[PDB]
Enzyme design. Structure first.
Site, PDB file in Angstrom:
ATOM      1  NE  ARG A  55      -2.806   1.366   3.495  1.00  0.00           N
ATOM      2  CZ  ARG A  55      -3.248   2.409   4.215  1.00  0.00           C
ATOM      3  NH1 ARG A  55      -4.114   3.287   3.713  1.00  0.00           N
ATOM      4  NH2 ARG A  55      -2.799   2.582   5.477  1.00  0.00           N
ATOM      5  CG  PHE A  60      -1.045   8.873   3.832  1.00  0.00           C
ATOM      6  CD1 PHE A  60      -0.606   9.184   5.142  1.00  0.00           C
ATOM      7  CD2 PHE A  60      -2.081   7.977   3.697  1.00  0.00           C
ATOM      8  CE1 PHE A  60      -1.173   8.583   6.236  1.00  0.00           C
ATOM      9  CE2 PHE A  60      -2.665   7.378   4.798  1.00  0.00           C
ATOM     10  CZ  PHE A  60      -2.217   7.681   6.074  1.00  0.00           C
ATOM     11  CD  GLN A  63       0.046  -0.179   5.946  1.00  0.00           C
ATOM     12  OE1 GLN A  63      -0.602   0.813   5.740  1.00  0.00           O
ATOM     13  NE2 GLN A  63      -0.438  -1.217   6.566  1.00  0.00           N
ATOM     14  CG  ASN A 102      -2.449   0.182  15.241  1.00  0.00           C
ATOM     15  OD1 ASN A 102      -3.589   0.459  14.897  1.00  0.00           O
ATOM     16  ND2 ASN A 102      -1.674   1.040  15.917  1.00  0.00           N
ATOM     17  CG  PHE A 113       2.879   3.783   8.438  1.00  0.00           C
ATOM     18  CD1 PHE A 113       2.386   3.156   9.564  1.00  0.00           C
ATOM     19  CD2 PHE A 113       2.983   5.182   8.452  1.00  0.00           C
ATOM     20  CE1 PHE A 113       1.998   3.872  10.677  1.00  0.00           C
ATOM     21  CE2 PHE A 113       2.563   5.893   9.569  1.00  0.00           C
ATOM     22  CZ  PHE A 113       2.106   5.245  10.678  1.00  0.00           C
ATOM     23  CG  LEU A 122      -1.531   8.475  11.528  1.00  0.00           C
ATOM     24  CD1 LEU A 122      -0.604   7.750  10.605  1.00  0.00           C
ATOM     25  CD2 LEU A 122      -2.830   7.709  11.696  1.00  0.00           C
ATOM     26  CG  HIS A 126      -0.631   4.252  13.853  1.00  0.00           C
ATOM     27  ND1 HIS A 126      -0.786   2.993  13.336  1.00  0.00           N
ATOM     28  CD2 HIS A 126      -1.813   4.866  13.703  1.00  0.00           C
ATOM     29  CE1 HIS A 126      -2.015   2.855  12.873  1.00  0.00           C
ATOM     30  NE2 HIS A 126      -2.652   3.987  13.070  1.00  0.00           N
TER      31      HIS A 126
HETATM   32  C1  LIG Z   1      -1.222   4.497   8.370  1.00  0.00           C
HETATM   33  C2  LIG Z   1      -1.212   3.115   8.968  1.00  0.00           C
HETATM   34  O1  LIG Z   1      -2.512   2.602   8.848  1.00  0.00           O
HETATM   35  C3  LIG Z   1      -2.935   1.440   9.589  1.00  0.00           C
HETATM   36  O2  LIG Z   1      -2.128   0.836  10.245  1.00  0.00           O
HETATM   37  C4  LIG Z   1      -4.391   1.028   9.534  1.00  0.00           C
HETATM   38  N1  LIG Z   1      -4.594  -0.376   9.215  1.00  0.00           N
HETATM   39  C5  LIG Z   1      -3.887  -0.968   8.270  1.00  0.00           C
HETATM   40  O3  LIG Z   1      -3.230  -0.295   7.499  1.00  0.00           O
HETATM   41  N2  LIG Z   1      -3.896  -2.290   8.158  1.00  0.00           N
HETATM   42  C6  LIG Z   1      -4.588  -3.222   9.026  1.00  0.00           C
HETATM   43  C7  LIG Z   1      -3.607  -4.002   9.866  1.00  0.00           C
HETATM   44  C8  LIG Z   1      -2.413  -3.414  10.159  1.00  0.00           C
HETATM   45  C9  LIG Z   1      -1.503  -4.076  10.940  1.00  0.00           C
HETATM   46  C10 LIG Z   1      -1.744  -5.325  11.436  1.00  0.00           C
HETATM   47  N3  LIG Z   1      -0.804  -5.901  12.199  1.00  0.00           N
HETATM   48  C11 LIG Z   1      -2.944  -5.941  11.149  1.00  0.00           C
HETATM   49  C12 LIG Z   1      -3.869  -5.268  10.362  1.00  0.00           C
HETATM   50  C13 LIG Z   1      -3.177  -2.949   7.087  1.00  0.00           C
HETATM   51  C14 LIG Z   1      -3.750  -2.543   5.751  1.00  0.00           C
HETATM   52  N4  LIG Z   1      -3.032  -2.320   4.616  1.00  0.00           N
HETATM   53  N5  LIG Z   1      -3.875  -1.981   3.560  1.00  0.00           N
HETATM   54  N6  LIG Z   1      -5.105  -2.029   4.174  1.00  0.00           N
HETATM   55  C15 LIG Z   1      -6.369  -1.737   3.476  1.00  0.00           C
HETATM   56  N7  LIG Z   1      -5.060  -2.367   5.513  1.00  0.00           N
END
Ligand SMILES: CCOC(=O)CNC(=O)N(Cc1ccc(N)cc1)Cc1nnn(C)n1
EC number: 5.2.1.8
Length: 165
Positions: A55, A60, A63, A102, A113, A122, A126
């Site tokens: 992602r 921004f 990730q 998370n 990220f 955030l 985070h």
């Molecule tokens: C700016 C950071 O944003 C976050 O952490 C929010 N959740 C996720 O990105 N997750 C959910 C998540 C994150 C970490 C863990 N350990 C489990 C789920 C992963 C993800 N990536 N793309 N999508 C649509 N979701």
């Protein structure tokens, strides 16, 4: 006594792009720092080597670290599937901040990220644990393969990683 340094060698559709290195704030967030360090060396038998940045959103963040499901639904820490938010001393101040992704309070695994903008909103949810030390130009290069919805136009992978020094 000195914070550790780790590197990733990034590839774009298999072709070498360059290397990014990170200072891990083991002084302030030692548990969270040690997790990313050990996933980067692979010393526990699993980790970031070969995984992708699933992602990427320009203006921004980039990730990745979902090394079990490759799409944001997986990963695990060296401590179990999940571990607690260690503290929130450090804030999201600008480009180059390294921070844990998370899914709720105390659900840190392996996903992280790198910020490409200030992401103040955030703060306090985070855990910030490092920053880009060298190769912010390679993070910016990576960022140009992202999109508004986060889907990458070419596959961005961690070809190799480990610890410097
Ligand atoms: C700016 C950071 O944003 C976050 O952490 C929010 N959740 C996720 O990105 N997750 C959910 C998540 C994150 C970490 C863990 N350990 C489990 C789920 C992963 C993800 N990536 N793309 N999508 C649509 N979701």
């Amino acid at each position: 006594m000195v914070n550790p340094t780790v590197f990733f060698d990034i590839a774009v559709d298999g072709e070498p792009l360059g290397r990014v290195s990170f200072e891990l704030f083991a002084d302030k967030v030692p548990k969270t720092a040690e997790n990313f360090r050990a996933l980067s060396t692979g010393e526990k038998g699993f980790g970031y080597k070969g995984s992708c940045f699933h992602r990427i959103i320009p203006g921004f963040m980039c990730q990745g670290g979902d090394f079990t499901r490759h799409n944001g639904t997986g990963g695990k820490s060296i401590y179990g599937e999940k571990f607690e938010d260690e503290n929130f001393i450090l804030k999201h101040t600008g480009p180059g901040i390294l921070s844990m992704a998370n899914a709720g309070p105390n659900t840190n695994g392996s996903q992280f990220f790198i910020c490409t903008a200030k992401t103040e909103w955030l703060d306090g949810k985070h855990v910030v644990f490092g920053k880009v030390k060298e190769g912010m130009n390679i993070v910016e290069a990576m960022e140009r393969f992202g999109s508004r919805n986060g889907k990458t136009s070419k596959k961005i992978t961690i070809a190799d990683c480990g610890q410097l020094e």
